[PDB]
Amino acid sequence: KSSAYSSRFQTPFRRRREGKTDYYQRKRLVTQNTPKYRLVVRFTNKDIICQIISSTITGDVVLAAAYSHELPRYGITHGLTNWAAAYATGLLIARRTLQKLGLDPRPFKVFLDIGLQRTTTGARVFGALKGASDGGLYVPHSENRFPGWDFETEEIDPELLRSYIFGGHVSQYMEELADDDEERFSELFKGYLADDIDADSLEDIYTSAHEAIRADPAFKPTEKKFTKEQYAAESKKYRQTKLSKEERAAR
Amino acid sequence: IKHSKCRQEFLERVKANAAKRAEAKAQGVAVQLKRQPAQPRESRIVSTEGNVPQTLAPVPY
Amino acid sequence: PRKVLQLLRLTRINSGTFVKVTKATLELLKLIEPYVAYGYPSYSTIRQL
Amino acid sequence: RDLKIEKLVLNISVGESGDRLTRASKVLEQLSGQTPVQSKARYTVRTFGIRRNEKIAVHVTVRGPKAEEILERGLKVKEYQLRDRNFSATGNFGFGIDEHIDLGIKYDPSIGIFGMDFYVVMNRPGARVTRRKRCKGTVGNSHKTTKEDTVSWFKQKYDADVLD
Amino acid sequence: NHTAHNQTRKAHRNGIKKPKTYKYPSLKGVDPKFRRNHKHALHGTAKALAAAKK
RNA sequence: AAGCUCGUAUCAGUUUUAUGAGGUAAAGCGAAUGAUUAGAGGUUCCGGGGUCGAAAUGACCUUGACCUAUUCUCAAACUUUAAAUAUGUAAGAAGUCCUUGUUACUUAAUUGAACGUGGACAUUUGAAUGAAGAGCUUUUAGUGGGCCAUUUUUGGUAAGC
RNA sequence: GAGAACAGAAAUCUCCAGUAGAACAAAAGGGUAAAAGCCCCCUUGAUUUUGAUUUUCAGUGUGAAUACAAACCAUGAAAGU
RNA sequence: GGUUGCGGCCAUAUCUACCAGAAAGCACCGUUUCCCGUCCGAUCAACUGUAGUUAAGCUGGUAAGAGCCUGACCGAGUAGUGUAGUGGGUGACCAUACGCGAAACUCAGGUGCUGCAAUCU
């Protein structure tokens, strides 16, 4: 590329160059002297991140957070990325942010933020919406993108939508691998076989889990490992240094 | 479509004027809180024991 | 310059006023320079005026 | 960092619209097992008897192990010999075959004879970094394939020499 | 045809005065949802300063 | 002109401080763009058009559809940077702070918003200088062919243009 | 720019580079890159009531426009528009 | 101190080239019954964190690199300009008095800073 080319063009924003944030969508959400709250739900590999985030020109403020790795405290230890654990996390923030406001006074209202995930019906994103709306937040929505919505008619199946909450599409799929082709069933679900959790009891585990979330949402932190300063020492072992000019002049 | 500094800077000068009248009320002393333009500067003894002044001799051309 | 000659009360020709020297008033003399003659007066002239 | 085939693209370019466009569309359907997609023309040249947006030609893309059968059966028509160049700087190759009955078919006097273009694209694993939507990135030079790396790979399996 | 000569010297005979910025500016043009509330807000606080503090 | 309500009112063809806005002079062209004068041949790479035609395998024409492989030079309708002079706003009593009243708007929330009660802040009360008073209203005359000069300029070779 | 039967100066397909050199009904100048371009999906807000404001201006008209209020709606999971 | 989520200011953060990254975290990767979307489970959807990986991604370090940004008794008080005279010159234009004051260039130095929540030898 020529010299005058790189002198000319301006870069995008750093949070735009790195592909994380869509600045067309953010301007609608933030600009709505009252702090304006927003439900940010992100789905990576092996994790669920659900945060209620306000807005400030300093840059942001987080009111509450629920993570997937806190679910083993509540009794869900397997399959953390699926639809049903996403519903349980949506229940989880709703009890959590409400207790610190003491409402558990019209409703408390939050706006859903997706990110970049494409809106398809039956997505795992809106299970976090359904959990917060059942939990007690005013999250405005319509019954389009829930699973069990027919494209033909303007109707919903509450029986199928109850099923996906309690691990229906998982535990039915355990039944098709149990009778057929164990070699597939031995590879997947291996945490279920070691803990000896059969398929029908999986619906019993999620049902006790929502009773566990409404019991104690007070979020004890993980204790920690060694310290900050012990953790700061080992991280300095890998990180290099800058070079001075006199070291670079003779080079 | 914009926002303007000078008034918000004017507000900070009112805040500083609030403190100066509070201190002078405690210990009796004049406030002298008005601003002043630049004054003609004072006398000063200047001795150049470091550096003897040099001629310029406007030759150049 | 004509507004500045009124603000220093120099209405008619051969009229004179004392002016306190600040940074603010020095620029007022800087505009009306082709019309005024000024200097620093001693104790003798102020007593005689 | 192995050297898997991403996809196999099967193309046929026909000058006219009509039966000959629709007959060859059935050929690529029964061969690839997939319903093909058609492409319309961008503009009019009039040396070719075309107009804008006429659905001039068909193509179809195959991925996975089913594409490797179509390549291995197709390249035997070329008798395990490519020509010398045939390779991009990026790393990919294609070869065009006449007489689709060479890979055998019922004769089809209604359908007839067509010449299929083939093209192969090559990539290493880790190519989702470009094609994904969130946190898009570019593949580095050490992982970009080469024209060289296609020569080493294709000489090894399918037992061919390149040529010249 | 057109010239702007002597046009500055005419306007600076009576000077250029300001529109003198009254107390209590007129609420015509202010948002009507605010005007409808602010009608009732002054009504209660005139009643509350009548009976309570007297 | 007749005056009217008051009598230091807060204003000013001005500066200063604190911030805004601008894109001409100069700089820039080995930081993009950028003309101009003249044009040599390309019969389904066009057809913009003209007359014709009992048709369309249809003729006759013109600007040409196309610059096909050319160079160097700039600008009022080119730009990264950007003076001077002119220009907007602020320099407080209708203001600042403390305490808590009103509402049918706004907030998850008497939280905000807007307007206030009560209390505190005094002549250096918030730059300089000036003020033959400041503020306001009625009503009506004449005029609505202008020319000259310095400087910045457009058209015209150049004009008491 | 590099590759593919016929296939070439220009058909379709493929990949890398690509700050807009393209397109946005039309003059010219502004504006625009997960859009204001391009391709699809659903639609009628190109609706009702009449006030306020900006431009030319005597701060009259006319045309054009901007920000709300009261109604009913369209789209979207949603904020919004 | 290292990563992750959401950001503010938007190149000191870009671009090109090589080189390193214990830990945890992100990522690549595994599969196709259900929801869904295609010509194509590649993007998108679901399922599993189980079979495998730091080769990339990203993070960091380097390059008498390109670029960018701060500094300059650098250019230069030069160019330009406000005001003044019965100043000069046939003119073109130039001196002087009171003022304001550039730019490219040159050289020196720099190569992201940081807010909230959480997790880590």
DSSP output for A185-227 = HHHTTHHHHHHT--TTTHHHHHHHHHHHHTT--S-PPP--SS-
Report the C-alpha gap between A219 and A65 in whole angstroms: 9
CA of D125 to C1' of H28 (A): 7
Report the C-alpha gap between A11 and A112 in whole angstroms: 30
DSSP-derived letter for residue A180 is: S
Are residues D135 and A115, on separate chains, in Cβ contact within 8 Å? no
**Could you tell me how far CA C5 lies from the centroid of its own chain?**
9
Smallest CA-to-CA distance from A217 within A89, A63, A127, A108 is with A89
Q: For residue D21, what is the enclosing H or E element? A: helix D19-32
Nearest CA in chain C to B38: C23
Report the C-alpha gap between D100 and D108 in whole angstroms: 11
CA of C4 to C1' of H92 (A): 39
Report the C-alpha gap between A78 and A75 in whole angstroms: 9
Instruction: Tell whether C47 is within 8 A of chain B (Cβ).
Output: no
Residues 111-140 of D with CB under 8 A from A: 133-137
- Count of other CB atoms within 10 angstroms of residue A9: 7
Smallest CA-to-CA distance from D66 within D31, D38, D101, D35 is with D31
Residue C9: CB partners within 8 Å, gap ≥ 6?
A: C15, C17
DSSP-derived letter for residue B33 is: -
Q: Are D153 and D122 in contact (CB under 8 A)?
A: yes
Instruction: Tell whether A20 is within 8 A of chain D (Cβ).
Output: yes
N- to C-terminal Cα separation, chain C: 26
Are residues A20 and D135, on separate chains, in Cβ contact within 8 Å? yes
DSSP-derived letter for residue D144 is: S
Report the C-alpha gap between A210 and A249 in whole angstroms: 66
Instruction: Tell whether C24 is within 8 A of chain B (Cβ).
Output: yes
Nucleotide in closest CA–C1' contact with A23: G34
Instruction: Tell whether C20 is within 8 A of chain B (Cβ).
Output: no
**CB proximity E7–strand F (7 Å threshold):** no
Q: Are A88 and A209 in contact (CB under 8 A)?
A: yes
Report the C-alpha gap between A209 and A166 in whole angstroms: 10
Burial of A59 (0-12, 13-18, 19+ CB in 10 A): exposed
**CB proximity D42–strand G (7 Å threshold):** yes
Report the C-alpha gap between B18 and A243 in whole angstroms: 51
Residue A147: CB partners within 8 Å, gap ≥ 6?
A: A83, A121, A122, A160, A161, A164
Q: Are A136 and A107 in contact (CB under 8 A)?
A: yes
The two structure tokens encoding residue D23:
């007959």
CA of D80 to C1' of G15 (A): 24
CA of E28 to C1' of F91 (A): 31
Report the C-alpha gap between C19 and C14 in whole angstroms: 16
Q: Which technique?
A: cryo-EM
Residue A168: CB partners within 8 Å, gap ≥ 6?
A: A160, A162, A203
Burial of A213 (0-12, 13-18, 19+ CB in 10 A): buried
Q: Can you give the C-alpha Rg of chain E in angstroms?
A: 23
**Could you tell me how far CA D61 lies from the centroid of its own chain?**
7
| Strands D57-63, A111-113: pairing kind | unpaired
Residues of chain C in contact with residue B40, where contact means CB-CB under 8 angstroms, are 21
The two structure tokens encoding residue B42:
């004072």
Three-class SS of residue A152?
coil
Characterize A190-210 residue by residue with b for buried, 16 or more Cβ atoms within 10 angstroms of its Cβ, and e for exposed: eebeeeebebeebbebbeebb
Q: For residue D141, what is the enclosing H or E element? A: none
Q: Is B46 left (phi over 0), alpha (psi -120 to 50) or beta?
A: beta
Segments in A113-157 forming alpha helices (H): 125-135
Tokens 């007489």: give the residue.
Answer: D99
Report the C-alpha gap between A112 and A93 in whole angstroms: 13
Question: Which of A's residues 107-136 have CB atoms within 7 A of nucleic strand F?
Answer: 107-109
Burial of A167 (0-12, 13-18, 19+ CB in 10 A): buried
Sign of CA dihedral C2, C5, C7, C13: negative
Distances in Å between the Cα of A164 and the Cα atoms of A82, A123, A146, A203, D135 are 10, 11, 10, 10, 30
**CB proximity D50–strand G (7 Å threshold):** yes
- Establish, for the pair of chains B and C, how many residue pairs have beta carbons separated by less than 8 Å: 9
Three-state SS annotation for D39-97: ECCCCCCCCCCCCCCCCCEEEEEEECHHHHHHHHHHCCCCCCECCCCCECCCCCECCEE
Distances in Å between the Cα of D32 and the Cα atoms of D19, D59, D65, D74, D99 are 20, 11, 12, 12, 17
The two structure tokens encoding residue D100:
């689709």
